[PDB]
Amino acid sequence: SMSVKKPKRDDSKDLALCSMILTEMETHEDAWPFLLPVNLKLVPGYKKVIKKPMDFSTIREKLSSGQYPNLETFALDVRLVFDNCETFNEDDSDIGRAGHNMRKYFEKKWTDTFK
Template sequence: MTSAVLSGRNEVHHHRWGDARIPLMPKPSNPNPRRHRPSPNPSPSNPSAAAALDVPEPSQSGHVTIRPSELSRREAQALRTRLTGELGRVRALLSHIDSWEEQRRPADPQQRHHVSPPPALQAAMRKRCTQILTRLRKQKISVWFNSPVDVERLKLHDYHAIIRNPMDLGTVKENLAFGRYPSHEDFATDVRLTFNNALRYNPADHHVHRYAGNLLATFEGLYKEAVSWFEQECQHLARQ
């Protein structure tokens, strides 16, 4: 599974709540299912099920033609599962790329010497982050991510070997409420970590993997709007 290293909180381009340029629980009893690890070369007991996962060879142009009307019910279900899993991986990779590009982008010289935004604007941005988190947590599928993974009860013996930095939306909510995030970059990093952990641990064809990809995409859209608003407000203050 494709993965990328998340940005740490000590990156050179890390910005505080007051900076102008910003890149940046319902409690379930089963936040993440056990990851099933197939053998490297499995021998399917059901040959027809294995055949259902076959996809036609691409043409010379690199395109694959699939005719739904020619697929059996089992083949259609298998193809849907495969494509949905790949979509989740693509969304996660795009999130990593966006974060990496933002971290690598040089600071605008006009913004390096700006006057720090007033406390009221900083508080407004924190409020927007809280609203984003609330919207995520209210979604039905977020029940898998609203509290820490109960590793002991679920007997996920390999969880901490795979996930070195566990995170969940309930912990993010607590950190945000108690002012533990120096900037909204830190807030965004932990939200992304929550979903990227689920994408990393759960197989691509598992529903938790798909839910994580969907919620991550939702978060990125909401967060981008909030950051755009904050940057515009900071630029307005800088011109005064």
């Protein structure tokens, strides 16, 4: 509360570390469904159904341009990529499987880097 704070966590490396995680997600062999925005002209139903599209290239641009106020807002956009994927793709599809795999991969890196 006012004049009452928990001890200050060092957040000075968060930006660099989120960048490294994102690089690792970019270079995973199962990243291909997520590298670029879904083409809303060419994929029927996506525009209407997925209210907040997100992809790794868009996260990269937001990250590089100071549009994440903190590491939690960065995690929210990564998870949004996978939540979108589950909303639109059957579990038993290459893309559905890719999203589960990448979510797992992300969550482990996130815990190991920050928790």
